[PDB]
Amino acid sequence: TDQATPNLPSRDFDSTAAFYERLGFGIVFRDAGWMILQRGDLMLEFFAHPGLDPLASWFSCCLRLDDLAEFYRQCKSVGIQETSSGYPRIHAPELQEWGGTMAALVDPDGTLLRLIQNE
């Protein structure tokens, strides 16, 4: 079926790939400049962006899930730090100003993945 997937930057496909495999994602494809991961219907696509600054990055995306808790349980179990400085880190699910519950995830490359709880 029709569907739009994001394109996120990676300073090293190996690390990226390694980091997402621990969450349930795997490799659907991997070229020298393009890699695709996937966990269930969640599919993310990366591209090489060597000249990127993880601290000045504005890249992000949403992961609207049916069970944010479970998925957050995993991020913790895989050892992602629950700090408020540096990357990668996670912030527990908090009721957002817009009425939705959303947890934050910052991948190895400073990309922000807004974890939202599907309604």
Place this chain on the structure above:
Amino acid sequence: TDQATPNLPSRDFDSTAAFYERLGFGIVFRDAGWMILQRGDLMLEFFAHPGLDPLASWFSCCLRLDDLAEFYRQCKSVGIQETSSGYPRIHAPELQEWGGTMAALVDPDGTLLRLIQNE
């Protein structure tokens, strides 16, 4: 169901919205700092990025469609230029180096939308 959606920038929600509406997309949600457009199962999300350079931007995403042809018929019929310079523009479907047929669409902020045929 669990999905992944892109986070694209928007120098002006009005101009953006206008642009996408012509492609069958319609607003699902609109706030002051966040907009969500939808079309069937496709769903993009936008954010305010006034200090963005449409020429130096690296933002993009994939629209894996069941009928790339028709979707491209819309982009054409609504007047999008098929040039190779300037934005917004489009590039006819070309068999990609990875064995897939993909057409390229660039919106008013220089964001690349890879129109790929679903296998």
